[PDB]
């Protein structure tokens, strides 16, 4: 006996978490902000001075 994963139930629950009839404009940002707490991603360093060739 294996606990089978239901991808259709999964997308239904994602859409609810994202805000339900259309998706709010911030739906993927909302999901991504939750997802970041499960990753160990580093921010990146960006600048303009010295980026010019040449």
């Amino acid at each position: 006996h294996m606990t089978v994963f239901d991808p259709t139930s999964f997308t239904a629950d994602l859409l609810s978490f994202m805000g339900l009839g259309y998706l709010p404009t911030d739906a993927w940002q909302k999901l991504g902000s939750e997802a970041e707490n499960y990753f160990k991603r580093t921010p990146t360093f960006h600048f303009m001075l010295g980026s010019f060739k040449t």
């Binding site: 921010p43 360093f45 600048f47 001075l49 010295g50 980026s51 060739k53």
Partner: protein, 231 residues
Amino acid sequence: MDRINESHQRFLQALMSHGIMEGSAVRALHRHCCELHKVHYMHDKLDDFVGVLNRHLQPLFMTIEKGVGEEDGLTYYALVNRVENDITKMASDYAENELELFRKTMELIILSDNGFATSISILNLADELQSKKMKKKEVEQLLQSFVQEKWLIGRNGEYTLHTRCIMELEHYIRNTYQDVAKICNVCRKVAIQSQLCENCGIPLHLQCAGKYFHKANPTCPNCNESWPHEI
């Protein structure tokens, strides 16, 4: 002379992600970083806190600078690069023709009396580029990126340099555009938006004009003609 610890690292990560932050948000970030990492929060030690970071960032040619917004008079902190070398040229944000257009737009902003470039002026600069040509749609998408990344500030289809851009490029502008960049007669720093003497052309920051002329017959500090603008 604190040892750099996780509160400093958390602060630096947040500032790296934002590029620039307003002063009241920075004070709140400092407090939150101390609480998140069990460091005793001292409201009176923000300068020391930033100073710890800057001591360690200095050999990386990075620093956390402070500046004042030309429009709003607010204090900003920005993580800025401080060197031009073979490694910094490996930055991958923008293509060569995109940065050519950025430089020509910056030049027009520096030259302009108002400190803003219009959409049409940027489209005309793009059409004059000697590099691979960009369509109108591509120019509009590039401008939206420059605004999103806080290199430009955009208002009704007009663009000026972001505070972040002035903070990082202050000395680059002074040297690359020494013939044309406005140097405030009061504080001697680059001015993008300014009040100009209409007789002799010298510039003052709007905040510096309010201070210097704070007087019922105000006169230009350079040519002594009466100041035409409102204080």
